[PDB]
């Protein structure tokens, strides 16, 4: 295992079984395969549409061109207030 790669690291978990200088682990140190979606119950979403509607209506009363609509909740939630030009701090109360 010196200057010649015989085993396949893609079919091994740890490449340190035998001394070598031509093998590297596929899952290096600091790499952690973790599921991107866990089996955790999500918070109830019953009142989220109403909260979004109320907040968007109030904010549109001050920013008519902000385009704050309930139908855009799936896409609006991914943007920040600075991108929308809305100062949520003043209107939070």
């Amino acid at each position: 295992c010196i200057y010649q790669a015989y085993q396949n690291p893609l079919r091994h978990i740890n490449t340190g079984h035998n001394p070598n200088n031509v093998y590297e682990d596929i899952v290096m140190l600091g790499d952690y395969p973790v599921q991107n979606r866990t089996h955790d119950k999500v918070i109830s979403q019953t009142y989220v549409p109403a909260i979004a509607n109320i907040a968007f209506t109030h904010l549109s009363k001050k920013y008519p061109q902000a385009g704050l609509k309930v139908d855009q909740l799936n896409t609006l939630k991914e943007k920040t207030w600075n991108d929308l030009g809305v100062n949520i701090e003043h209107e939070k109360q």
Binding site: H39, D40, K41, S44, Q45
Partner: protein
């Protein structure tokens, strides 16, 4: 002996208490059941069925 006796006792107590169900809640569509059961130290542990 001490280490393994403690480990065996705790693990088997947890296994005995695992079967019992503390809480059960359906999902919104009633497709999954979230079950809260006893942990090794008597706290809540989550599972999905």
């Amino acid at each position: 002996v001490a280490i393994y006796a403690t480990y065996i006792a705790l693990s088997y107590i947890n296994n005995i208490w695992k079967d019992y169900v503390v809480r059960a809640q359906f999902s919104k569509d009633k497709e999954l059941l979230f079950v809260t059961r006893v942990s090794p130290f008597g706290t809540t542990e989550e599972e999905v069925y």
